[PDB]
């Protein structure tokens, strides 16, 4: 049964236990990962920000890339909070790119559906791109932003 379950595992229960956003490298360099935040913490904690991810060549960074000199330990960072949306914070030494458009470092930007962040700009052959996937399930809960106090 494991043989079928392995395949079915893809289609069956959709992933999104408490996932915020999923980072997927389209240029084929970094392995896909799942970013997540607790709803109770976000719904209970209504401050400036809830949870933020740090991405880069650093093993500490919430995201471990390959090994590109053009990228910094923590090339970019993603923050989750505000209300029911997401924000992208660039934190690279050389800069973080969005669909070819370079954004202001350590600046907050409104996330986009299936958005993509490019990094390591300088040489056409030294640029790396990343795609961000927003969890529809998560948005559903945040969209309502209402405490499920209904028995």
């Amino acid at each position: 049964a494991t043989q079928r379950f392995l395949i079915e595992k893809f289609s069956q229960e959709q992933i999104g236990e408490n996932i915020v956003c999923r980072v997927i490298c389209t240029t084929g360099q970094i392995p896909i990962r799942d970013l997540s935040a607790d709803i109770s913490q976000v719904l209970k904690e209504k401050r400036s920000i809830k949870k933020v991810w740090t991405f880069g060549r650093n093993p500490a960074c919430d995201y471990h890339l390959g090994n590109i000199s053009r990228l910094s330990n923590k090339h970019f960072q993603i923050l989750l909070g505000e209300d029911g949306n997401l924000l992208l914070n660039d934190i690279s030494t050389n800069g973080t790119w969005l669909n070819g458009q370079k954004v202001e470092k350590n600046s907050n930007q409104l996330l986009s559906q299936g958005d993509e962040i490019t990094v390591g700009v300088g040489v056409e052959s030294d640029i790396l791109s990343l795609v961000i996937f927003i969890n529809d399930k998560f948005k559903q809960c945040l969209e309502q932003n209402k405490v499920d106090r209904i028995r």
Binding site: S69, R70, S72, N73, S92, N94, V121, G122
Partner: peptide, 13 residues
């Protein structure tokens, strides 16, 4: 060590 640029800042010029 010479100068192991941990992360080049793009020598713009």
């Amino acid at each position: 060590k010479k100068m192991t640029f941990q992360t080049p800042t793009d020598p713009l010029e």
